[PDB]
Amino acid sequence: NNSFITLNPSLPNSENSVIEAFSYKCIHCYNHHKFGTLEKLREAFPNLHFKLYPVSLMNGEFSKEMNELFAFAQYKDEQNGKDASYSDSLSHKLADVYFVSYFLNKQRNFSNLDEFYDIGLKAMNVNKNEVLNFLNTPKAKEILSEFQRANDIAKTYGTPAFVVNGKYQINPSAINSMQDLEDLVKKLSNM
Incomplete structure (x- = not known):
């Protein structure tokens, strides 16, 4: 499957969360900020922290x-x-x-x-x-x-x-769309 890798050890204080590692000098990060990717993930997953x-x-x-x-x-x-x-x-x-x-x-x-x-x-x-x-x-x-x-x-x-949950780092090649990202966050947060 290779849609994600597992981090070892897990990130501390990460349960029930999506963490976005970002740079303010990265166009892709800027585009996700303007698009509201994290806000949209909260709409799908109100019990996760961002x-x-x-x-x-x-x-x-x-x-x-x-x-x-x-x-x-x-x-x-x-x-x-x-x-x-x-x-x-x-x-x-x-x-x-x-x-x-x-x-x-x-x-x-x-x-x-x-x-x-x-x-x-x-x-x-x-x-x-x-x-x-x-x-x-x-x-x-x-x-x-x-x-x-x-x-x-x-x-x-x-x-x-x-x-996701301090453990599952999404491979960006595994997703095309916002809904692909939502679906993979659901799968990983329910492992």
Whole structure:
């Protein structure tokens, strides 16, 4: 069958989930963001959680700081009843501003971190110190550790990469359509 590979070990804190490993510099990731792929999967599968895993080796010079901002967004979205499948989540808004920066606003280079960091902080209506205080917590360090698996996940087939229940990574060649992706997420989430 080869429609998926099994990750070993499983991704932590992944049960009942679809994880999308993505880059803000990837056209395919941008197209899935604009299309609302994760929102559509929530329409089909309201009991699954949807999470973004940024791929730091594809996210350029300020990739570590981008991972920090996504860890904060993931944290805060849990406090607010949202995940990455809601357009008004902090995770979706944060992905949106960086996709807009790169694909609409032609920004490739920043001469220092704070020009880059400020885009994310403005999208989430927070400041650098609020993010720094969150980063200095065991739970933030745990979320950032989880994102380290995104790099090898992305290398297998490219981005985006969809992972079901922390275990089953979908081969992009196995699907043509949104409904093909839904059907495979159903099969894998019921294994």
